[PDB]
């Protein structure tokens, strides 16, 4: 009925439809409408006290909860979506990436090359469309598909 992995849900305080895709975790009003070698993404990172290493360019040591980085992350979706800020502004501030100073950038990538639920992600973007929440060993992260 939909492209890969949408689905119909449903609005706890509107009660109106709304579609989610489960590799994404993007949510969105309007239907989805609708696979390439290499895709090109970038990715704001928020790490964790479990991230596979807890230091990054922002901390030597990174304390914070998984649910406080979780938070951290719906509030920069949050300021993406209403045009507040810009992806990039907020991946080169705050990204616990070393690409934070290439404004969130990795380049293009093949399957096979980056965490699986990343990869995922990144694959079942289409282009211009930014993720959901995104789980990984290295943390928490928000992707946006450029290629
Ligand atoms: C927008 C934006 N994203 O990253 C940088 C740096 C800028 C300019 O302020």
């Given at each position: 009925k939909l492209p890969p992995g949408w689905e119909k849900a449903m609005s706890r305080s509107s009660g109106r439809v709304y579609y989610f895709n489960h590799i994404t975790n993007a949510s969105q009003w309007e239907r989805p409408s609708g696979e390439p070698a290499r895709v090109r993404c970038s990715h704001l990172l928020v790490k964790h006290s479990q991230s596979?290493?807890?230091?990054?360019?922002?901390?030597?040591?990174?304390?914070?909860?998984?649910?406080?980085?979780?938070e951290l992350i719906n509030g920069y979706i949050q300021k993406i979506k209403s045009g507040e800020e810009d992806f990039e502004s907020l991946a080169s501030q705050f990204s616990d990436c070393s690409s934070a100073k290439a404004r969130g950038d990795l380049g293009a990538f093949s399957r096979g090359q980056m965490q699986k639920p990343f990869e995922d992600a990144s694959f079942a973007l289409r282009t211009g469309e930014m993720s959901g929440p995104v789980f990984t060993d290295s943390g928490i992260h928000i992707i946006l598909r450029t290629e």
């Open positions: 596979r290493r807890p230091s990054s360019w922002r901390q030597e040591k990174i304390t914070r909860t998984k649910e406080e980085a979780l």
